[PDB]
């Protein structure tokens, strides 16, 4: 302002950015086998 004349200018600006990525997992595998022989029929148990 100079002296009548008056001037005023105000500017405001804000920005915000956010990113969140999360991944959690588990996989399990297990195999077991057997084999046997027996050299009366009652013993088959």
């Amino acid at each position: 302002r100079v002296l009548f004349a008056k001037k005023t200018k105000v500017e405001h600006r804000c920005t915000t950015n956010k990113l969140s990525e999360k991944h959690e997992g588990s996989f399990i595998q297990g195999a077991e086998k057997s084999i046997s022989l027996i050299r009366s029929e009652y013993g088959a148990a």
């Binding site: 029929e41 009652y42 088959a44 148990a45």
Partner: protein
């Protein structure tokens, strides 16, 4: 929006060749994968 797909198919075909006891081991495969010890002994005796 949420969508879920469930699909599980398990089929068994036991072969027990005990004339009458042969069908027991085949029928026992429904929900019971492991063979019964007593039923196995009965089939062995047969």
């Amino acid at each position: 929006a949420a969508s879920g797909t469930q699909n599980n198919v398990l089929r068994g075909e036991p072969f027990i060749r005990g004339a009458g006891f042969i069908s027991g081991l085949s029928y026992l495969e429904l929900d019971n994968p492991a063979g019964n010890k007593r039923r196995y002994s009965a089939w062995a005796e047969s």
